[PDB]
Design a protein around this nucleic acid. Sequence first.
RNA 1: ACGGGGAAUCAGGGUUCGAUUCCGGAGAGGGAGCCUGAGAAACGGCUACCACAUCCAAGGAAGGCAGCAGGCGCGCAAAUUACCCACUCCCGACCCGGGGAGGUAGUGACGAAAAAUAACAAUACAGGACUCUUUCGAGGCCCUGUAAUUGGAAUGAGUCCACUUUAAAUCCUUUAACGAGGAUCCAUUGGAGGGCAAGUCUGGUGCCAGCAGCCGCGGUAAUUCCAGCUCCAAUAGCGUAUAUUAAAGUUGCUGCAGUUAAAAAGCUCGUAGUUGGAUCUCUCUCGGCCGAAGCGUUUACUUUGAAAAAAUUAGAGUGUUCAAAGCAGGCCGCCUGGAUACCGCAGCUAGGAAUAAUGGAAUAGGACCGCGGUUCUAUUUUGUUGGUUUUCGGAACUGAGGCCAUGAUUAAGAGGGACGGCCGGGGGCAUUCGUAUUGCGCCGCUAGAGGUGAAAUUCUUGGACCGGCGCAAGACGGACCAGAGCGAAAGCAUUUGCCAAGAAUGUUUUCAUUAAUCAAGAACGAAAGUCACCAUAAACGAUGCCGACCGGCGAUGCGGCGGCGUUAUUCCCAUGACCCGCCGGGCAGCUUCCGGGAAACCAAAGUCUUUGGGUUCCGGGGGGAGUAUGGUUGCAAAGCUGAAACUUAAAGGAAUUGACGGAAGGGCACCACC
RNA 2: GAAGACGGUCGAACUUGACUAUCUAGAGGAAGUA
Lengths: 44, 141, 149, 129
Amino acid sequence: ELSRVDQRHRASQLRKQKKEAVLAEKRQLGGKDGPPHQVLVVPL
Amino acid sequence: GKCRGLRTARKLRSHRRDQKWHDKQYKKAHLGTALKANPFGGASHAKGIVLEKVGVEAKQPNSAIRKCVRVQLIKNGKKITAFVPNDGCLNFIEENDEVLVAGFGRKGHAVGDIPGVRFKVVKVANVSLLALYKGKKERPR
Amino acid sequence: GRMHAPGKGLSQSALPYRRSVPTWLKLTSDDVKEQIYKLAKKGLTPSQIGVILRDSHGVAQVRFVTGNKILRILKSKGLAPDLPEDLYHLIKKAVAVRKHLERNRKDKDAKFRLILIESRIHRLARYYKTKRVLPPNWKYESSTASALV
Amino acid sequence: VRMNVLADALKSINNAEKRGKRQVLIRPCSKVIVRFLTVMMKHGYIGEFEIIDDHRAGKIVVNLTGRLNKCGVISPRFDVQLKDLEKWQNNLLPSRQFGFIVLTTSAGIMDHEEARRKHTGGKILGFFF
RNA sequence: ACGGGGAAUCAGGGUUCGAUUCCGGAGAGGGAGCCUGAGAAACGGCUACCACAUCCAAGGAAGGCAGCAGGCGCGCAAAUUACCCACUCCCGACCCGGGGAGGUAGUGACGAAAAAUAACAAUACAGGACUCUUUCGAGGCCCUGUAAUUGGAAUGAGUCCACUUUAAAUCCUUUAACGAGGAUCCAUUGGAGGGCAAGUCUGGUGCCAGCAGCCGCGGUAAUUCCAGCUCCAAUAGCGUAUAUUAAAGUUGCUGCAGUUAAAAAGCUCGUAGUUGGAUCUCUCUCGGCCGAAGCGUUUACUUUGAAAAAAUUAGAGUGUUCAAAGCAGGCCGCCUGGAUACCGCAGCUAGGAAUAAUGGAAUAGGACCGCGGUUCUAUUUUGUUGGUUUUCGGAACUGAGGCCAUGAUUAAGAGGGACGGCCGGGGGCAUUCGUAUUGCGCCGCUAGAGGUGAAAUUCUUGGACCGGCGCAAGACGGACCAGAGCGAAAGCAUUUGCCAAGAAUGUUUUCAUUAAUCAAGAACGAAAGUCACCAUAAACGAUGCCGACCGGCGAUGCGGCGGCGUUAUUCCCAUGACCCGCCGGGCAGCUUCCGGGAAACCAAAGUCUUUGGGUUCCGGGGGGAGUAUGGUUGCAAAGCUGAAACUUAAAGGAAUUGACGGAAGGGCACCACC
RNA sequence: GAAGACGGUCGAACUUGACUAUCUAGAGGAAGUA
């Protein structure tokens, strides 16, 4: 980005994108919209 | 000849630091363009997703097909062809695999026979290739 | 070698070792100073007085007879020029080139020689300005060149 | 133009001692040169010399006994502290058993071994062995 | 890029790192504003906005882990939601309470220190060496083993009481009992062609699979792949990747290079910068013969002193069982430590005075002296008081006189400038000549003239070409013309005149350091190109500039100095042309074990590991590429400046042996010719 | 002596422009890459 402020700005945009992706992966389960978290239990 | 007088310290050091940029090792490691072109970004290793297995053809004074892997890195999305060292080690590699990629030895230059390949595979599915090759571990199912 | 010329040459005077006046010379200090005084009133430069006193009077060195130089005698008496004689001859040569050059504008090898003469004037004027012979705003200029001689 | 007139004289009696000659004429003389040559003569390296009086500057005719290997100047005259003397004689001198470094100290021009004995530093002029 | 103390590496010089436990700063999601208080613009305080985000009954309410744990994410990359205030300290009203500061355990092959995986004896060896034997062969003579040969001896790793340790524990240390023979109580990681220690042993493979940092190995005998066996190196460690240091005298201050390998600017001028020739041998008032009062022109330099946190580093002492460590310990209540050095630069202090800068008297407004005059003033002075008055003493300014050896260093085989006679294809302007070419006028002649290896192309009886006569036009100056001359370089040649320069020489002239090299800045600049610009070349000695030193030899050009003798001016000198020298700069050449250099070669490309005279530009493996982009000048062409991605193990220079021909010269054969 | 209000100041932020930068959805194509 060839400036110290714009480089920090670009890195924060990428961090916002990646954090949106990870939160969208971890939103699908056990919450207000997702299916229940199914725990199979086995004693070995 | 060079200036030698007792008050020549500014001429001497401003000439050395300007002639230092004509050295290949200084220009590489103090400019910043070569670090932005390095797909590892200065790291020793990296991690990527195997996109496809790729056979690369050896350079002219010998003849074989080197078994490389086209892998897209995780941390920046750059694509990379990387060499899988021993024989029957391409059999250990599926597609869309986690893979660990190192440098190949000459710090960004292509090691001898393989044309334009700077990287090699170290782990596949978080198991080292040496443990698979010598039969110490197996690929998880 | 030479400053502005590309040559070198070993041609100069060579004073003797003995600093005394010779025994044939009968002129004293005061009549030699009288000769210098009467010769300076014909407009003769300090370098032209010593040639006259050497050639036709037997005065080999005025410093050895009088204990003083030619220019210091003319400066202590008051008979000295305003600007020194080696800077005077450089401005006189720069005038004569510029006079010739305004007739002959295609003369490239007087235009080049004018720059060598004029840069020698500035190099000599700076020395006299450090040693406070010239007043420290005197400036040679091509417009007021011809009036100074 | 001629700067560092001692560098002329030490190159002249170096180049003449190599040619096997018995005498060198060095000009112009200077009082630094005479004190340098006196240090060399008192340790046996040159022998007697005669200063020729022109009224302008001197000339010196040095006699040569063929014991000199090398005579050098150091330009510029660096300041040499007494703690820094060992590095200079490591670089310049060929052995710890012979050779000298000439310093101008404030107690005069002397060799590096005498300067330790007078407990003095100074500036370096040159070296001979 | 938080800064230092410091760290790694290191001949010497250096290069790189320092987020990180000590010190200093900053900030508590982003900015901003505040309250309280000695202290805060505080965030385990408050108030907003911005971004996120929690509870809700939808009205409202609450938030800030870059503290300790822990989680998610991110990634190549990093530990326990443990115990305790016992130690070190801190806070409070306080001997008492509290402290995720801190201590203690856990995980911990970051890293550092110590250190097991066996020792011994007896046998046996168609071992080896040692004493005798000529040799065989003999020895308690000494060693070795690839003996699952024999033998009991010694131990920890473990298992595990107890004590000790600790806040309580663990660990270590100490001791019971058990604990070894294939002592299976099993050492690994990389290699085995070279670099580089160690197998052209064996099978498989057959340019495949693969190995290989590099050179290379592999195509049916692989010393190199895949395996077995053997061997090598380091060893509880050893490979790989990346950063970085040494190697790298491949960034060069020490200490490199620039003719031909990468490379010196077209030329001269010229600001800053850098560098610059000799020369010059301590006293005054008091306080007790010494100090207080001055320094001596001013610095640099050098030596000293004091001031410089600890830790770290160097280093003294001291048997942590040794060591890395630690700061303790040692005698029979005593005794002794807890040193010391280094800490650049800048700033303080005191000595030195060589080197290197700078100052001081040249219109004398100079010093040292007494004498004089003008203005103001210390306050001592008059038993006290009041007032006047001076003196004394001190400044600030001016006149004469005396005195000083009164006062200017020499004149660079540094540089300017004069002067003298010369010299030159140096330059400009004017002028003069020469032939040739082109065109024109006339006359004679007749069908060809041109160009090539060959025609081709083109003009002629509308008489070409030719031969003679005359005129003009633009030019251009042959031979003489030289390994000669001049010019800064491009470059410069007919006669004569004018103008303004210049080198060298000669000088017992003059100034007296005025100098060298030069960013920036400027003047001229082949030839091509463009409407005056353009400023570029094998612009080439493929070779910065200034200075010193270092071999010979003969010519030549200019100037000067001498010298037999020839000529010319009728004699005579005086000169010119020759001849024999000498001196000084110049253009060159020959030569050489001066010394260099990779060599070709070079008297500089020498005086270089015995490395430093001053200074400018400039190179760093080959390409990409003098390319793209940006800036700038130019009307434009172009000029200056000028990369990166990527690719590659060589490209390149000298020299030597051969190979070649449709290159030129020689010798030879009826298996060649005549 | 609280709420409140005029004014001043400090001033986060908000809106509209202009310039500039980045992340993303994006037709078309070209060349080289093999």
